[PDB]
């Protein structure tokens, strides 16, 4: 059993580490707006969008009952960006940087839970 406040305490530092990456987190701080970004097929490819602001709202409001649900949303966010964007693109490379940061942060946290 994990209380919501125990999950905020343990997991919020791993989310803050992503926000601290500038400019790499900037494309991830708000939901992808396909009209603004000129990517009209985005929602054909990405069926379940996810981003930092949505993960933060779910963690703050206590919507994760177990740590693996939070980790799954972080990886969904990353995978959506690797799927949609080309491997040579700026956002794809930013995604890979954030994933490296996340792996280093989340692994010790999950060992302690």
């Amino acid at each position: 059993i994990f209380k919501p406040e125990e999950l905020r305490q343990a997991l919020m530092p791993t989310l803050e580490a992503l926000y601290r990456q500038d400019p790499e987190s900037l494309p991830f701080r708000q939901p992808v707006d396909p009209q603004l970004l000129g990517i009209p097929d985005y929602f054909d490819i990405v069926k379940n969008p996810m981003d930092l602001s949505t993960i933060k709202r779910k963690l703050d409001t206590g919507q994760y009952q177990e740590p693996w649900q939070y980790v799954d949303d972080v990886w969904l966010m990353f995978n959506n960006a690797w799927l949609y964007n080309r491997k040579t693109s700026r956002v794809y490379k930013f995604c890979s940087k954030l994933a490296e940061v996340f792996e280093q942060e989340i692994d010790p946290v999950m060992q302690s839970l």
Binding site: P27, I39, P40, D41, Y84, R86, V91
Partner: peptide, 6 residues
């Protein structure tokens, strides 16, 4: 993929 984010 046709489009890149702009």
């Amino acid at each position: 993929r046709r489009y890149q984010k702009s």
